[PDB]
Amino acid sequence: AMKIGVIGAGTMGQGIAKAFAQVEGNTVALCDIKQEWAENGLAKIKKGYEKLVAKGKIPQEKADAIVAAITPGLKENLCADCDLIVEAAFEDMKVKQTTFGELDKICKPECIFASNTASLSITEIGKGLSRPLVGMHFFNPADRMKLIEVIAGCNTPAETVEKIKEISVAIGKNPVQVNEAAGFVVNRILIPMINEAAFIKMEGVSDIAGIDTAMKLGANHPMGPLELGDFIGLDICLAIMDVLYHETGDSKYRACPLIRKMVRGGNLGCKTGKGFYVYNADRTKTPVDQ
Amino acid sequence: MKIGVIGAGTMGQGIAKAFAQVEGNTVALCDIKQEWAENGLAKIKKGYEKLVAKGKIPQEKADAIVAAITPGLKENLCADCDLIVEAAFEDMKVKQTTFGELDKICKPECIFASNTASLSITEIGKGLSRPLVGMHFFNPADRMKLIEVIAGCNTPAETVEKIKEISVAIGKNPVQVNEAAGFVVNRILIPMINEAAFIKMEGVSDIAGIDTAMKLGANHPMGPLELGDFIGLDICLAIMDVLYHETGDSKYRACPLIRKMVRGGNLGCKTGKGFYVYNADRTKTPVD
Amino acid sequence: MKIGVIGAGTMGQGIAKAFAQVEGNTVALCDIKQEWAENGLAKIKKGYEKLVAKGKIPQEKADAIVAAITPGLKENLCADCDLIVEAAFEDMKVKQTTFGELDKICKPECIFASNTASLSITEIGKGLSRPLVGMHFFNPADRMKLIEVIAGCNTPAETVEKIKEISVAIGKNPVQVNEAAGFVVNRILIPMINEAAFIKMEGVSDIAGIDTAMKLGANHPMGPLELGDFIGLDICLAIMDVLYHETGDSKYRACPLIRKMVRGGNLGCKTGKGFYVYNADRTKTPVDQ
Amino acid sequence: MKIGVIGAGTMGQGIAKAFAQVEGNTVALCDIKQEWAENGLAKIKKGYEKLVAKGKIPQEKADAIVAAITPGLKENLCADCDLIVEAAFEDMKVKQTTFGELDKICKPECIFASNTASLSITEIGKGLSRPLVGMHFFNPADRMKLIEVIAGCNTPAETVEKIKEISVAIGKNPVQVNEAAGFVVNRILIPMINEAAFIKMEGVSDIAGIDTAMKLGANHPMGPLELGDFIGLDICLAIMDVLYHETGDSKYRACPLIRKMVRGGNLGCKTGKGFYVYNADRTKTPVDQ
Amino acid sequence: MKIGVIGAGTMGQGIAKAFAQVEGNTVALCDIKQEWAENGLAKIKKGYEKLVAKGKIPQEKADAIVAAITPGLKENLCADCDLIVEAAFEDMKVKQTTFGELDKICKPECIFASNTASLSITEIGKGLSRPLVGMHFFNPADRMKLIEVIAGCNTPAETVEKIKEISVAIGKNPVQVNEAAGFVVNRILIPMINEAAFIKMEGVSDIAGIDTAMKLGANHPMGPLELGDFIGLDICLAIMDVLYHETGDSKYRACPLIRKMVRGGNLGCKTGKGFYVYNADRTKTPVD
Amino acid sequence: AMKIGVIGAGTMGQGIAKAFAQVEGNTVALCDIKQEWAENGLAKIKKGYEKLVAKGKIPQEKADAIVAAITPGLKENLCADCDLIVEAAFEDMKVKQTTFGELDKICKPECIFASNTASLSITEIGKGLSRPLVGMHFFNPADRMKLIEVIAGCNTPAETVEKIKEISVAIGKNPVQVNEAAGFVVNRILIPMINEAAFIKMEGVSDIAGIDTAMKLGANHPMGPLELGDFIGLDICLAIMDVLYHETGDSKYRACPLIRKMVRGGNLGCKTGKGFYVYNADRTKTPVDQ
Ligand SMILES: CC(=O)CC(=O)SCCNC(=O)CCNC(=O)[C@H](O)C(C)(C)COP(=O)(O)OP(=O)(O)OC[C@H]1O[C@@H](n2cnc3c(N)ncnc32)[C@H](O)[C@@H]1OP(=O)(O)O
Ligand SMILES: CC(=O)CC(=O)SCCNC(=O)CCNC(=O)[C@H](O)C(C)(C)COP(=O)(O)OP(=O)(O)OC[C@H]1O[C@@H](n2cnc3c(N)ncnc32)[C@H](O)[C@@H]1OP(=O)(O)O
Ligand SMILES: NC(=O)c1ccc[n+]([C@@H]2O[C@H](COP(=O)([O-])OP(=O)(O)OC[C@H]3O[C@@H](n4cnc5c(N)ncnc54)[C@H](O)[C@@H]3O)[C@@H](O)[C@H]2O)c1
Ligand SMILES: NC(=O)c1ccc[n+]([C@@H]2O[C@H](COP(=O)([O-])OP(=O)(O)OC[C@H]3O[C@@H](n4cnc5c(N)ncnc54)[C@H](O)[C@@H]3O)[C@@H](O)[C@H]2O)c1
């Protein structure tokens, strides 16, 4: 028995709502700024489940049971008796401090405040609050990836972190404790990978398909780093690289200019149909270097 | 086709098996001492009997592979070789004189390839009478499917192409690489291990946590700290130092934590202790 | 052909001359203040007078090229031009806004070219209706024979080629260059100037010594410190900053001596004081005396 | 005056010419192998023959300067010289040893000067009995008018001045420079070449484009890639490495494309292949074709 | 001599006392609001009565210092000032327009000086009709003896010399500085505090241990982590960021540990918690 | 009651021997490679004490009592029943591993092995030993500076560190625990100070006397950083800067070229009569920039 409020109905908010709603005994309030926005979020969840049912990867009952646990609305209306708040709204500092400032008055004292941010400081978001703010970082798709990075801020008490650890185990995830630093663990290791592969291509060491083939066969990775950058989104990789660079001040994390040029041109990868690979209707992908 | 493998260590053994695996290939497994070459084939042979007993290879096929491998010295076995793959000790002068001697022994049409990962292909074959190309295998070479074909500064495109064709003939996937420090895999893979150590060093997370996050968050087969322990932390340290000295870029500075562990003999699996202690059972315990 | 030059500074003037000195071209000069745009065609008439007096130009030729330059009001005239060359301030949102207010004013079929020194061609032309290409001139634009032709990711070959033909049609040599911070010349030339300032700041030599060393040792036409003053030290600083921010590499960090000089208005020739003081006798004097 | 040149490569030859082409001087050329030292005076006689045939030199003048260059055996002749100019391999212990074996051979009162490109003047001359001064020539030494005069911490003014007088006495322009890695010209010029290689390696432009850009855009006499081949790419690499190690600043990290070319013997003009291939037709061809 | 001090905060108060301490000087303590200037003098006055009660100053001398200080607005009090020392809010546009207004108010021979530590002296007085020089005091200005005289790009040597003479006239030791980020003291002192935080962050030692080692090993009066807490970690962070952005050199990258503490409001003494917790007694406890 | 063996009779070895011999109940075996070398070491200790007696800063009895506790000789002869070994010989890796390899056979099992190194790895020195190797770092002059940095290597057990902590407190010093990293704590902070001051001078920001005056009055430091570099020895500052740079690979610790040029010229500071200041017979020092 647990009531979970997810603030933000975009991609990540939908996946987090699904992650909690999969576990029996959990109810999710999927909130956003405008009521229609949260309705579109749940409709996008409903539309996604109808596809998995057609492809025979989920029973219709389970999809219906999951959807019936998610209620769209406003945090003023649905988050009073919540036990956990996981915010997953737009990555803007002021918006996050405003959301949690309002939630501090709406929610009961026992409610735990968590944020799914990846680019902003857990410490700075929850500065003026009356209760701890902790990082609960999921990975796309949140309902299937089993990792959760638990982020301890400068003033987050150890009990707050432990509670998030139990909640993660209860929903069938594997919590990993991270003391707040740019990129945490996964992003800090994974995104410089893609960056290095781009440097390799830009410097003419090898070609795109070669670079990806080498990392798949030589390191037994599931995807090549350039394939992965297209899938993750090159605009997101560029932002992570720049955040790592600005937080540390270390030229080690300087972004590859080839990546910066591609983002400027709108070649963001899978979501625009073209990145390091061109994605064609026949489900064929070809490297832009032919 | 007849191949000469120079160096009967672990890598040379794997390369010999990779070529002898394919019907119609003969391999000359050479070293500086005849006994070493015969010991290399003995290690190759006994490894195949464990495979036969495990029922994972016909007894006659294993007998055929071993029969296709001849041990000895390069002066005696490499005159009519079609391809030479060097996999001896990683020293520039050792490799240079080895290929200067092979330059006089081998017939003109014989191709000279090297398995080096850290030394410059271009510098290896600087003053030779024929091109030098890189044919970088991955351990275990008989099982791993990737072959990095390293083009030197003066390697003709025809030599690169023939190595590509040989790679597919033995069932591998060649990827052309213009010579640079760390090639492709090592340039991307080892700084990853280096980054994870930095994360540990700076107190961001714990060893087991770091490794857990990479397999469950990035879908990797092994965590980077386990991987560094498996590769061996002395190898990782040496690769980082090569990348640093070849580029002059502080981006590749090795994590001082790793350098401290290498100095204490904590190299990983090969010594039983790295980021993990490897107990007599099968479990491994992080030194955290 | 009708050409519209956006900007009336040292380079807007030279680009105008570069087109007007070739027969059958007509140029529309533009700036912020009409007074400054009129100061443009004024400083052009002024320089051709000295050249005619020195016998280097026939007065008939000079009067003919000055008759092909018509100072618009920032536009009104920039409406029928077959080619646009902007030479405004090296700031990003400045060039978007300008090209933004320009996609309306000019004719539907008309080529848009930017004379930017190091900025992204792709980002400058984003919301535009037509391609945006880089056409980089070099000070002095009427004399230097090189044109760098830079294409964005979304720049067709028909526009890159048309720029190449227009370049040879006015007696220039176009070299195509892929999009990167500083392209070729500026990426090489400006850190050279930056290095020269570092050498002065660390006291390895004085201003005079550094410039005669590079002139008498590398056969360079101007010392790197004169060339800094000639280009405009504000321009050099802006290019180093773009280099540093685009690559993230401290290799391109601007020399603090130049940043101090730009903060004081010691920009070089265009303010009479940079690394040299420019006296009315037509002589220059190093500020370190 | 009697002058002893230590080294018979491209610069030992040019420094010899620079002194011998001025009346009343006599030069002693030296190298490792007498065959190589004799190859020195041979390649000098060879070049003056082509100049005389081209009418650029009177044969009487050329024969007079070739008569002032006497190839010693690495010394025997370097004993009465009033000035030593070493132009040996740019390695530190190489120059100590050479100047070490030289403090005996030469006369007690005789000036020791090094033509080093970037190495510490102070460290080169440490155990010596006399001061050690830097006298830096520039390829081609008989034509380039600049001489960099570099003093160590323990170098008196009488020696720095005597070098300044000898410089003007042979028609050169001496500029004094404080001791630092690369002095002035090389610190500015070689990273310029290094940058040009980075631009090629990252595919911004091809070899031809880069060199015509700097020639037609900055009025440079040679493109930075030709100049790399002309200087010797081994020399450029050594200078970048000295720069990187002396400052510890990754700003001066040598371009990996140059290090790859030097490892292959593609040194430029002196091996017929660098960034260009040098054909017998007297034409050069970019290796990227 | 008559001095105008612009800004009645802590620094402006100290500079006013430093000049009014010396017999024959009058000071105009100005701000943007008349009440603020009067509150600055009130803080100056009450600080002197605690000194009289402590027996560390004659009652009449303290009465004379306070009497030499007049509060108000610069338009009313600064027309006949001989020297202007600005110590208001550190914003480029604020300081620029302040000196543009003073350019019209003050008599031509009046010298314009600024106490800024992070903003460019050269840029402050860019378009003025008279030179702008830096006169950087150290808190408490009436007690600390060092004065950094900052020469701008266009500051004449005569203006630098007159500030040197004024500094010795009021009993200080002027040190000429050609404008660069961090001048001398801040350029050396703050990266030291930054380094100690890096040492803590990387697990090399503990806070108390770090601070103990610096006073007992280097004979310093305060440990760097205590010093950062005393200076205030927001000030240290801002100085590191200025040094980084002005030089573009990664050598001055601020320690991410400090940036995390500043984000949590743990600024040091001014908030009661930094690297040390400052208890109600007098002891301080490291957050280790 | 404690027997202490000090290996190395140079400057640091003498000061360490004096540090232990000052405390009642301690006996010091001051060893070196050649017997005459250790005799010269004790003679230098004796000669130094005769000067302090003349200047009236120590009683002759105390000097005599301290000297009577120090015995010169060879480690093969004097270190069998030692309770602590503090090596302070020349900073060369192989020499240190050889010394401790030999001492492992000579000394009783209870003997603690310590090294006063500042530039070399505690972990690497004691790699193949049969007992722990720990860092016990003193500061010149060791008999008066109260700080001791206790250096834990990769395999140093916590009890070894604690024993060194007690020994330091027993001899009236203040131990600080340091986990092995280049420069430890003090050198890593202090030497970049001097380096930065040299950069300030080289870049023409201020003059030598100004830089030192500013740090003395502005930061309340006892010595200016350039004064301090001359006193410490510029050759030593250059070596520390280079060790920090090579261990980390971080351009942040790159040595100032002005310092490198001065070391090449023999201007090492106080010990050569000239560094950033010229030291004249009349005890007057003048900055080399006049
Ligand atoms: C690395 C370090 O440590 C220091 C260094 O060296 S850094 C590099 C320094 N050197 C440079 O930078 C060189 C840069 N490049 C240049 O300056 C120019 O490209 C260049 C001067 C070499 C151009 O070559 P050039 O002008 O054709 O040679 P130059 O001799 O000046 O002129 C050609 C003429 O030689 C003339 N000539 C007359 N007398 C001559 C003589 N005694 N010797 C040689 N040439 C003579 C001829 O007239 C010929 O011209 P024509 O064929 O048209 O009649
Ligand atoms: C920052 C960016 O984005 C890109 C950039 O701009 S980077 C910088 C690029 N620009 C450069 O590098 C310039 C470098 N410097 C140089 O090339 C040379 O110093 C220089 C060409 C400017 C030298 O000046 P110069 O040679 O005296 O001017 P130049 O016109 O070529 O020759 C002088 C002659 O003008 C001649 N002349 C004849 N017709 C002329 C005409 N229509 N216009 C101008 N000059 C004419 C005259 O004959 C005069 O010579 P005399 O007085 O002896 O008779
Ligand atoms: N040596 C050089 O000057 C160098 C050479 C080639 C190209 N670059 C680039 O050319 C462009 C201009 O160079 P410059 O020498 O004329 O600089 P400049 O300092 O002389 O002034 C630029 C001119 O453009 C005007 N301007 C600014 N914003 C404008 C706008 N929005 N619309 C119209 N006019 C505007 C300015 O008032 C000024 O007249 C820059 O992008 C520069 O990076 C200049
Ligand atoms: N473009 C240039 O070549 C450039 C220009 C000016 C100065 N620099 C410096 O001049 C010196 C030589 O330049 P280079 O062009 O002749 O190089 P190079 O490659 O042409 O050969 C140098 C010559 O000196 C010989 N040599 C090497 N060691 C010697 C020794 N111990 N004693 C006598 N001879 C020895 C070599 O055999 C060779 O003949 C170097 O220090 C270089 O840094 C060269």
Numbering used by the authors:
A (entry chain C), F (entry chain C): 0 to 289
B (entry chain A), E (entry chain A): 1 to 288
C (entry chain B), D (entry chain B): 1 to 289
What does the paper say about this structure?
The crystal structure of the tertiary complex of A2HBD was solved at 2.2 Å resolution. The tertiary complex belonged to P3212 space group with unit cell parameters a = 90 Å, b = 90 Å, c = 212 Å and α = 90 Å, β = 90, γ = 120 Å. Notably, the tertiary-A2HBD protein manifested as a trimer, wherein only one subunit harbored acetoacetyl-CoA and NAD+. The acetoacetyl-CoA substrate is located between the clamp-roof domain (moving-helix) and clamp-base domain. When superposed to the NAD+ -bound form of the enzyme with the tertiary structure, the overall conformation has been changed, displaying an RMSD of 2.202 Å. The most notable aspect of this structural change is the movement of the clamp-roof domain, which shifts approximately 6.02 Å closer to the acetoacetyl-CoA compared to its position in the NAD complex, with a rotation of 11 degrees. Interestingly, in the tertiary structure, rotations of Arg143 toward the adenine ring were observed compared to the NAD complex, allowing the acetoacetyl-CoA to be stabilized through a cation-π interaction. The acetoacetyl group is located in hydrogen bonding distance with the sidechains of Ser117 (OB), His136 (NE2), and Asn186 (ND2). The hydroxyl group of Ser117 establishes an interaction with the NAD cofactor, thus placing this residue in a bridge with both the substrate and the cofactor. Upon substrate binding, acetoacetyl-CoA is stabilized in the closed conformation through interactions with the conserved active site residues.
